[PDB]
């Protein structure tokens, strides 16, 4: 089960100074349209498509939506399954500067998906602790150029992926506090340990917040399965030698198939046991409404277009 959402951030001053207009428009609660600006001495501008194309998503958001409304529409409903032992995954996707970290982390004055989700998680846990015992841990790591760091304890350095079944980052810090100011301060400071751009957080830094939840019954004279749900909340990287071993392909392409031992990325390996049959995935794509962003916005809307 997959859900795709699209969020349009408000236009920025820097886009207005460059001279941009509005070309992205939420038309509808699940449809956005992308107007084509114009330019060039070229362009047979008549066309036939010719200047406006619509895209449909499970849900859409522009500047009218608040942080909590984005949360309610995207990840709130994952929570019941996670404490019940099901797995779930939320991606913030899109080009740099379009909203990912704002949607996922937010700000002190306007928090995002992380703390809102951690918060309904601890309520749901207490409204059912009549019958159940729970254990909750969370970690917050970076993947930067396939190197993993613990964002809550950078001193430890480069960590590896060891199987402890489930694939876990061997050695990573694990928090259990239930207060949302504390979590938010943790996640704010941990965000600043993300690898920076040599010229600011690198456009190539995945931030993964994972929350594990174990659930066992308080009734001890009947066995019952012990449950382990795993929520992943991801702030992705931005959307934006002779290797002629390519007849390698022009020769596998004769009766099919496969000739490469592909390596799974760290993020794929971490998400392997999750993201499967009875597991949910929520992607939140982000765009600018600015005309100066028309090409990235169209790549994004194409990629997420349901
Ligand atoms: N929907 C939104 N509403 C208001 N401000 C936003 C919104 N999306 C992003 N911003 C702000 O604009 C800037 C966008 O940066 P950011 O969210 O870091 O983009 P990304 O994480 O995709 O690089 C940030 O300063 C953020 O606070
Ligand atoms: Mg970011």
Residue numbers in the entry: 11 to 175, 178 to 211, 215 to 255, 277 to 342
Task: Please give sentences taken from the publication describing this entry.
KIF19A, a kinesin-8 sub-family member, is unique in that it possesses both functions, MT-based active motility toward the plus-end and MT depolymerizing activity. We recently reported that KIF19A functions as a MT-depolymerizing kinesin in the control of cilium length. Thus, to elucidate the molecular mechanism of the dual KIF19A functions, we performed crystal structure analysis of the mouse KIF19A motor domain as well as cryo-electron microscopy (cryo-EM) reconstruction of the KIF19A motor domain complexed with a MT. In the catalytic core of KIF19A, the KIF19A-specific feature of adopting two different interfaces for MTs and tubulins is utilized to achieve the dual functions.
We investigated the molecular mechanism of the dual functions of the KIF19A 353WT monomeric motor by solving its crystal structure at 2.7 Å resolution. At the initial stage of the 353WT structure determination process, the residues of the switch II helix α4 could not be determined because there was no corresponding density at the site where α4 is usually located at the center of the MT-binding interface. Instead, we found an unmodeled helical-like density, which was more distant from the KIF19A catalytic core. When the Cys283 residue was assigned to this anomalous signal, all the residues in α4 and the following loop L12 were reasonably determined. The overall structure of the KIF19A 353WT motor domain shared a similar triangle-shape with other kinesins, which consists of a central β-sheet of eight strands, sandwiched between six α-helices, three on either side. In the 353WT atomic structure, Mg2+-ADP was found embedded in the nucleotide-binding pocket. In comparison with previously solved motor domains of various KIFs, the remarkable features of the KIF19A motor domain are concentrated on its MT-binding side and include the long and wide L2 loop, the flexible L8 loop, the disordered α4 helix, and the short α6 helix. Loop L2 is located at the minus-end side (rear side) of the MT-binding surface and is atypically long. Loop L8, which is the major MT-binding region at the plus-end side, is more retracted toward the catalytic core compared with that of kinesin-13. The switch II helix α4, which is considered the main contributor to MT-based kinesin motility, is more distant from the motor domain than those of other kinesins including kinesin-8 KIF18A.
